[PDB]
């Protein structure tokens, strides 16, 4: 499933700019730029005061729609994080950020998480030298995520990795641009994430 529908409409419903599009969400075409109000006929009408449930539901939908993950996998991830030691929220975000597709996006081999998903499923990506086509693969610290030697001559990867020259990668990630490879150094700290999300609201949503 994994959605497959209009995206910037979600940019609109959550009331916060999301980047599901990669580029152009940086252009003033994002429609979040020109139409910050919710999608649909009633978008421009005055919104009534949201119930507590509304708030939490919406927040979790923001978190989930960011990573483009199904509710099944999302829920599973959350309960898994809940069973684990450590703060549930931070561990949740960590587990979310350890997904192969997301890592590929983070390293900038792809402009958007969805594009990253396609790059993974088609085997343009390798982990520690072996091809891994599963977008939900969990990266561990120490792993080297590289680009397929056979795929390095593709135009898209040219564009993307040429744009990555001079750019910085997150404190938990290293990037070797010429060899088109990168390393997952550690799990991201909560502070490391710029996510427009209160995780405690998500925890509270599933707490219901």
């Amino acid at each position: 499933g994994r959605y497959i529908g209009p995206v910037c409409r979600l940019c609109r419903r959550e009331g916060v700019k999301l980047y599901l599009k990669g580029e152009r969400c940086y252009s003033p075409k994002c429609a979040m730029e020109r139409r910050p109000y919710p999608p649909g006929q009633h978008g421009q009408k005055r919104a009534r005061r949201p119930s507590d449930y509304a708030v939490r539901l919406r927040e979790k939908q923001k978190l989930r729609r960011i990573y483009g993950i199904s509710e099944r996998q999302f829920r599973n991830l959350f309960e898994e994080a809940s069973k684990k030691k450590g703060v549930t929220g931070s561990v949740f975000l960590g587990l979310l950020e350890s997904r192969l597709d997301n890592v590929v996006y983070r390293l900038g081999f792809a402009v958007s998480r969805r594009q990253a998903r396609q790059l993974v499923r088609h085997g343009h990506i390798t982990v520690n030298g072996r091809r891994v086509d599963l977008p939900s693969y969990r990266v561990r610290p120490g792993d080297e995520i590289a680009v397929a030697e056979k795929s390095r001559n593709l135009e898209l990867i040219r564009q993307n990795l040429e744009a990555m020259k001079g750019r910085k990668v997150g404190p938990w990630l290293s990037l070797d641009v010429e060899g088109m490879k990168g390393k997952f150094l550690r799990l991201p700290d909560r502070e490391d994430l710029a996510l427009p999300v209160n995780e405690q609201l998500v925890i509270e949503f599933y707490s219901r």
């Binding site: 507590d52 549930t88 929220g89 925890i203 509270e204 707490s207």
Partner: peptide, 13 residues
């Protein structure tokens, strides 16, 4: 313990 969250009804929440 930390990380638990506020587990309560609307009012005492």
């Amino acid at each position: 313990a930390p990380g638990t969250g506020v587990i309560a009804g609307a009012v005492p929440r």
